[PDB]
Design a protein around this ligand. Structure first.
Ligand SMILES: Nc1ncnc2c1ncn2[C@@H]1O[C@H](COP(=O)(O)OP(=O)(O)OP(=O)(O)O)[C@@H](O)[C@H]1O
Ligand SMILES: Nc1ncnc2c1ncn2[C@@H]1O[C@H](COP(=O)(O)OP(=O)(O)OP(=O)(O)O)[C@@H](O)[C@H]1O
Ligand SMILES: Nc1ncnc2c1ncn2[C@@H]1O[C@H](COP(=O)(O)OP(=O)(O)OP(=O)(O)O)[C@@H](O)[C@H]1O
Ligand SMILES: Nc1ncnc2c1ncn2[C@@H]1O[C@H](COP(=O)(O)OP(=O)(O)O)[C@@H](O)[C@H]1O
Lengths: 328, 523, 166, 40, 83
């Protein structure tokens, strides 16, 4: 109807918008179109004094793809799709290549993602990521999920379940996993498993109902004709193995820490904080030793050391690194 | 046809400031298609928006905006639903009341069609009726959903909703074709404060009642994290103070004027912001000042501001933490309070276990969550936690404690605030080892140590600063204390001094020495 | 000429039986106000649905009708509550964990300051536990003045004996 | 879901609105006859 | 017949009408006067909700339970439905 009266520009491609919008319900397309039309119309109205309509440019009113892009980015937010705010809040400081393990982990993730798309005998595969604390294992999972390119991607973390009872957590997990069954492809990421059970070394204590609900939900195949991928993160592996929970998982991936002077120097150079003169001394000090520190801890130490005086940063940074040490 | 917007309406008269972007977006999305020439709109064949939702903290200008929007349009007088006034007891009354609201709109639409006038419906405290589904609240939501968008179509209605808890609102009522334009009204930054003061001090200036020594810029800069309602309260209190002073001083009119002194007094005594700094807490927790009895106090004070400046200036670390620990009766809470006060932040709060006497776990968790949520709606904050072991209810027997509170505290110590904001959490404790066993020391970014008095010289310096004993008595103690070391806290020392001071004028020293010897322990 | 609105309510918190109702009656009798409407907190509550709200709303009809009839030339009205804290408590935030008396608080908040403005009313509250009151009911728009009445000192006892023995 | 339906008891028929209504009109016949005779 | 007949003294609404209705039905079906030309047939889906006093011999004796057909039942239903 809009194109009937030559109201649509000649630089708007419908197929591009159709491909861009993934898993958009019917009403959201109408909402997007209405928002774009309203934004286009608003360009000829000024609201600061007695309302006056510029009736001279009304003959050159046209809708440009820029309006559609702006309305999509700002106004319309889907519900069964994906949003870029989660990846902007979980990949805050980005990802950098400080060695070989990152590439290997990314390759393994990509290989796992290809199987759950071109396979008919295993329509449900799960993997577990584990490592020492402060090793940055959630960012890698988020990056893998983003690079999967599946239509429906969701992240289930305990950050939204503060104060909830075990029953509430179980009924949130059930709701999420049920909503995940209404698509031809889906990825679900479980974050900090050892904090979804309320584990505490003393006793030890934990929630049995949540553990059972999680053990029963890892072996339920979706409706015929659909696929699913489950990723999970955890920093205490032995504890999970003790409760006989590693059987449900199909494989495992190990994320190591920095363990050489060259890797630390490369990471420092990539970050771009210290000058070359200081780099000379820091290399001369580190090369003849070994280190054991995570990336997050290194960033925090660098930030804390940067607050000193111009001619005291290096000494305090070295003192902090030695105090923390390695403790293999 | 007469235009929808009154010919005599103008923004300057609306009397609203600090909400330019929100009003511009509302006008662009809602009323944009109701002002263009109808002949053009007819070709596009597009339906108008049917709802608007506004949410935010108490006292920021929601109802005012709805009233102005209602009185802006040339439509007929709007309806009003003051809270949940549609409930009733007989089986089949709430639905009838709900249906009775849309009768006139449907009748007018049937009678006229595409030339009907506009209707307005204003809902107040919507979250008290429209709650998520799943026989007291599930047969009004269905009626409302069916009426808003049913088998028959309507194009001459507009629903405005208001609430303080947007999360509890149903989900099926917030989709396109329904109340979809959602806006948030938040504490105003500086320009908003200046605009609000100018709006609220306009009539008085026209009649030359404002003194010449009052500058609105200083008032705007001084008041931080106030909300419009608070600024209005401040002005009214100043005016009332001036009027009361004039009347009580002594026909005597024509000389009344508002001066800077009245504004200062009203701000200092009358107005207490909800998201601002309160000096009563600092007065209550620091009851004997701070005395520099040795290096450790200076070291701690020179370490605290470094962390404060790190959290204030950096950009890759929007969250910082620290833990103060030491032997009992060492004065940790006072040092933490002083460090917080010296930060000069615009939002400081202290959470202590003495306001939760007899509270269950599911109340302490709620209190902590509410405090953190409040701290999350300001561009800077500082939350202090003291007596962690009392929050956890730890007892050596067992051991026994609350797991839910521990998990909530652990989760709340790593969740960063929204993008662009910063936070700083300080915590104290007197039992480090137990915290380490529970695997809690791995979440704090740094730790600090406050030492006890370990040398006679420090004790003599503290006694001098206190100013209790004279030179002869001072030397009397020095002769016996300088020959060895001591181990006593500041609070215990004050208690011992107070206990000793109640003896006879000549026997104070002997009892003080006896008490010190009895209390003395192995370092 | 200044154009300043009047205060809309006050709150008095203190030990029971120290002279709070008497002061409330005298303050009304001093401003040439009409008969004050006294209401007891715990008596408002009811078990049927939609009965507490009706009782809360029944106390404002006269003010609204007088304001409508006489416009801005109406007199003054006063409403006094008793154990107000027993009908106003902090509202829950988590979904599915709300209280049983939130509708009453919502209705009171809507009536005290809603879309339509009333300028011929005044509210006095008296309580003993001022720390259990909601937060939205203490902002400068409502109940913006709080006072404490304590146990009397020697001068107070002497004056009380004088008054009661004169 | 505390609520309850209600039952009704009509009264639009009063057995005491038939005595006075009938007795009242029974006395105007003589007056009408007398006035008719007077007019004739 | 289960909508209007239920165990008396159980409703928590306006039971003042249901108890009277059930009592009237009980009195009329078999009371002081003997009838010999009346036949009552009742269907339902909740056998255990009907009032016990209504199922005593003399008022409702014949009770039948209809279940799922067996193999011969299916081989007969299909034949009936395709003549
Ligand atoms: N190559 C990298 N690998 C991992 N993290 C990286 C890398 N480059 C940058 N980062 C940053 O490291 C930060 C570490 O945060 P994250 O929550 O993933 O840590 P974690 O050690 O897995 O968690 P936890 O503290 O709960 O044990 C991420 O925010 C990411 O921004
Ligand atoms: N930007 C502003 N300009 C002028 N006045 C303002 C502004 N914001 C708030 N106010 C003041 O707000 C008061 C009305 O408050 P309002 O009705 O918006 O409260 P609210 O947010 O609905 O409160 P609550 O939800 O707690 O009931 C008026 O006195 C008005 O002066
Ligand atoms: N320089 C100082 N440092 C610490 N406290 C001081 C100092 N000078 C005086 N004080 C007094 O020390 C008192 C110690 O009180 P506080 O509650 O902080 O003690 P604490 O030892 O941290 O607590 P707890 O008894 O719970 O272990 C404070 O009331 C303050 O009056
Ligand atoms: N300041 C006072 N002056 C005179 N009488 C007082 C005073 N304070 C209390 N009383 C007396 O105390 C009694 C109870 O007062 P009342 O206000 O009814 O108490 P409550 O606050 O419990 O309602 C009355 O007889 C009143 O005269």
């Amino acid at each position: 109807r809009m194109r009937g009266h030559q109201l649509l520009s000649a630089d708007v491609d419908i197929k591009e918008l159709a491909v861009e919008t993934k898993n958009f319900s019917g009403a959201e397309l109408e909402g997007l179109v209405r928002a774009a039309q309203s934004t286009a119309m608003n360009r000829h109205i000024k609201a600061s004094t007695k309302v006056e309509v510029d009736m001279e440019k009304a003959e050159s009113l046209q809708v440009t793809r820029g309006d559609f892009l702006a309305s999509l980015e700002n106004d319309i937010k889907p519900a069964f799709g994906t949003n870029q705010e989660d990846y902007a809040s979980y990949i805050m400081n980005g990802i950098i290549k400080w060695g070989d393990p990152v590439t290997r982990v990314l390759d393994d993730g990509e290989l796992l993602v290809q199987q759950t798309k071109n396979s008919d005998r295993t329509p449900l595969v799960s993997v577990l990521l584990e490592g020492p604390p402060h090793s940055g294992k959630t960012a890698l999972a988020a990056k893998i999920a983003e690079e999967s390119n599946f239509p429906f991607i969701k992240i289930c973390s305990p950050d939204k379940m503060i104060g909830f009872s075990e029953t509430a957590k179980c009924q949130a997990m059930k709701k999420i996993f049920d909503d995940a069954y209404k698509s031809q492809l889906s990825c679900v990421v479980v974050d900090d498993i050892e904090r979804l059970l309320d584990y505490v070394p003393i006793g030890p204590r934990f929630s049995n109902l949540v553990l059972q609900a999680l053990l029963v939900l890892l072996k339920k195949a979706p409706p015929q004709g659909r696929k699913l991928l489950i990723i999970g993160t955890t920093s205490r592996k032995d504890v999970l193995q003790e409760m006989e929970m590693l059987n449900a998982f199909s494989t495992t991936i190990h994320v190591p820490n920095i363990a050489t002077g060259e890797q630390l120097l490369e990471a420092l150079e990539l970050l771009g904080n210290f000058k070359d003169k200081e780099r000379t001394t820091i290399a001369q000090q580190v090369k003849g030793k070994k280190v054991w520190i995570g990336i997050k801890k290194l960033l925090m130490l660098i930030e804390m050391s940067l607050q000193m005086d111009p001619e005291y940063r290096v000494r305090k940074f070295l003192a902090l690194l030695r105090e923390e040490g390695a403790s293999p | 046809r007469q235009s929808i917007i009154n010919p005599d309406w103008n923004f300057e008269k609306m009397g609203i400031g600090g909400l330019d972007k929100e009003f511009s977006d509302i006008f662009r999305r809602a009323f944009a298609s109701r002002v263009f020439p109808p002949e053009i709109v007819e070709q596009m064949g597009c339906k108008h928006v049917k709802g608007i939702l506004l949410y935010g903290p108490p006292g920021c200008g929601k109802t005012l905006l709805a009233r102005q929007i209602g009185k802006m349009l040339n439509a007929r007088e709007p309806k009003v639903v003051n809270g949940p006034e549609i409930l009733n007891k007989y089986v089949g009354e709430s639905e009838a009341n709900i249906r009775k609201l849309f009768a006139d709109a449907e009748e007018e639409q049937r009678r006229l069609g595409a030339n009907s006038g506009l209707h307005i419906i204003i809902f107040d405290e919507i979250d008290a009726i429209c709650k998520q589904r799943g026989g007291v609240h599930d047969t009004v939501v269905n009626q409302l959903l069916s009426k808003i968008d049913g088998v028959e179509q309507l194009n001459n209605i507009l629903v405005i909703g208001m609430t303080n808890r947007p999360d509890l609102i149903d989900e099926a009522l917030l989709r396109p074709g329904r109340l979809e334009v959602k806006m948030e009204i938040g504490l105003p930054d500086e320009k908003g404060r200046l605009q609000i003061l100018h709006i609220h001090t306009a009539r008085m200036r026209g009649h030359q009642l404002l003194s010449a020594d009052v500058d609105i810029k200083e008032l705007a800069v001084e008041t931080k994290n106030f909300s419009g309602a608070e600024l209005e309260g401040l002005v009214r209190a100043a005016q009332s103070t001036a009027m009361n002073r004039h009347i009580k001083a002594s026909e005597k009119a024509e000389s009344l004027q508002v001066t800077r002194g009245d504004f200062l007094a009203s701000l200092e005594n009358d107005i207490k912001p909800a998201f601002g700094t309160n000096q009563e807490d600092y007065a209550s927790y620091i009851m004997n000042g701070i005395i520099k009895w040795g290096d450790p106090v200076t070291r701690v004070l020179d370490d605290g501001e470094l962390l404060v400046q790190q959290t204030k200036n950096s950009d890759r670390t929007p969250l910082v933490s620290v833990l103060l620990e030491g032997p009992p009766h060492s004065g940790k809470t006072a040092l933490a309070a002083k460090i917080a006060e010296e930060s000069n932040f615009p939002f400081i709060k202290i959470c202590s276990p003495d306001k939760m006497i007899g509270f269950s776990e599911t109340a302490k968790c709620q209190a902590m969550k509410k405090i953190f949520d409040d701290a999350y709606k300001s561009q800077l904050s500082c939350v202090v936690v003291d007596d962690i072991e009392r929050l956890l209810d730890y007892v050596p027997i067992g051991p026994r404690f609350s797991n839910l509170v521990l998990q909530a505290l652990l989760v709340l110590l790593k969740k960063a605030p929204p993008q662009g904001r910063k936070l700083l959490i300080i915590g104290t404790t007197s039992r480090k080892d137990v915290l380490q066993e529970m695997e809690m020391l791995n979440a704090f970014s740094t730790t600090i140590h406050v030492p006890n008095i370990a040398t006679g010289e420090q004790l003599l310096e503290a006694l001098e600063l206190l100013g209790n004993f004279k030179d002869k008595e001072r030397t009397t103690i020095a002769q016996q204390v300088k020959g060895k070391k001591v181990w006593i806290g500041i609070k215990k020392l004050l208690m011992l001094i107070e206990m000793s001071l109640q003896m006879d004028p000549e026997y104070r020293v002997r009892k003080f020495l006896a008490l010190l010897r009895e209390e003395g322990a192995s370092p | 000429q200044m154009g300043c609105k009047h205060v809309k309510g006050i709150l008095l918190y203190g030990p029971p039986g120290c002279g709070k109702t008497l002061l409330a009656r005298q303050i009304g009798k001093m401003l040439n106000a009409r008969e004050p409407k006294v209401v007891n907190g715990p008596e408002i509550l009811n078990k049927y649905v939609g009965e507490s709200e009706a009782n809360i709303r029944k106390l404002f009809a006269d003010a609204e009708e007088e304001q409508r009839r006489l416009g801005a030339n109406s007199g003054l009205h006063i409403i006094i509550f008793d154990e107000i804290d027993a009908i106003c408590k902090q509202r829950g935030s988590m979904a599915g964990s709300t209280g049983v008396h939130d509708t009453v608080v919502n209705q009171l908040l809507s009536k005290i300051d809603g879309v339509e403005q009333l300028n011929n009313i005044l509210v006095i509250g008296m309580t003993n536990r001022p720390d259990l009151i909601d937060e939205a009911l203490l902002r400068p728009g409502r109940l913006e003045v709080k006072m404490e009445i304590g146990l009397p000192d020697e001068k107070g006892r002497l004056q009380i004996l004088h008054i009661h023995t004169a | 879901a505390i609520f309850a339906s209600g039952i009704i008891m009509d009264s639009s028929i009063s057995k005491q609105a038939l005595s006075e209504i009938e007795t009242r009109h029974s006395e105007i016949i003589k007056l009408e006859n007398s006035i008719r005779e007077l007019h004739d």
